[PDB]
Amino acid sequence: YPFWAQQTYPETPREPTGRIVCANCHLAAKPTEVEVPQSVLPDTVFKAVVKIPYDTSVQQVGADGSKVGLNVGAVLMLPEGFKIAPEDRIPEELKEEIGDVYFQPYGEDKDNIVIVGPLPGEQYQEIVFPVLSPNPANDKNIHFGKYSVHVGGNRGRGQVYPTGEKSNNNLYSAAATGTISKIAKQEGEDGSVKYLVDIKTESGEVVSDTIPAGPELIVSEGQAVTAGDALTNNPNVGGFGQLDAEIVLQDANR
């Protein structure tokens, strides 16, 4: 979710590698688009439209094991001075395009970074962010010049939680080499508890990895397995993307 990124990276959402912290947990990579006007005049509202497309027929494993469609979210990074446009300045044509989303600043201080999500993807594959352009006359540090605009766009569930635990939308590798001595899908309440054991014949040791509900196996009993091998398919059908656009704050005169 954006909210975890807010809670534990307020001043480092664009890591110095140029990668966005979403990547840390939303591991798979999928494309994100962003159109932005070529240029804008001081103190005017414009739209940075972001797209986060994906084959909508797909379905993902929900937290509980059942399969459900995807949700979408994003982070848009603007230069200092630029910020969410207020309601009075958003005209009605633009107002209906934004539907009823609720942009939050990444941090009360970071007005120039603006987030949204989770929201259903069917409705919000594309998102229209109003943005008020700043004014150099009323802001010395800002100037008439080119400027970068980075963006992050996510779809579907990620693989790792802030605590480092895995989620059930990911690959459960083996934690062991060995042969498999027993298997049993069982039913619990929301979904299956998969049970199994491995005999590290090499080190004379037994372990019992556990696999949550939702994935489905590749391996079978009696098959030799290597440490780190894929026990399940990878069920992740979503991912993360990022890009940047340039915008020219333009002098009214030339």
Next chain:
Amino acid sequence: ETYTVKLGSDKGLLVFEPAKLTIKPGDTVEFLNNKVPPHNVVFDAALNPAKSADLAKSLSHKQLLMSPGQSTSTTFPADAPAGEYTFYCEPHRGAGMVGKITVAG
């Protein structure tokens, strides 16, 4: 009965005021997404006397309520004695957005 829990006291903060709603065995109270959203609440099968979700499950809600200005309702059975049926604002769980429905007994 259906009372309104303003999930982040509208012109105040991300809190659940007045935190200790002493309802009666049934009360169809709603959770209202007013600002900085969404607010969904699972029910304490952990923090309460009858920490038994199976009682209804509908009790324990959850999954991003993208309802800009709208509420969802949680009803009980009548078979609800001395119960502190505590509720969870999921994406906010800790920032004073937790409530304790207290069905008298």
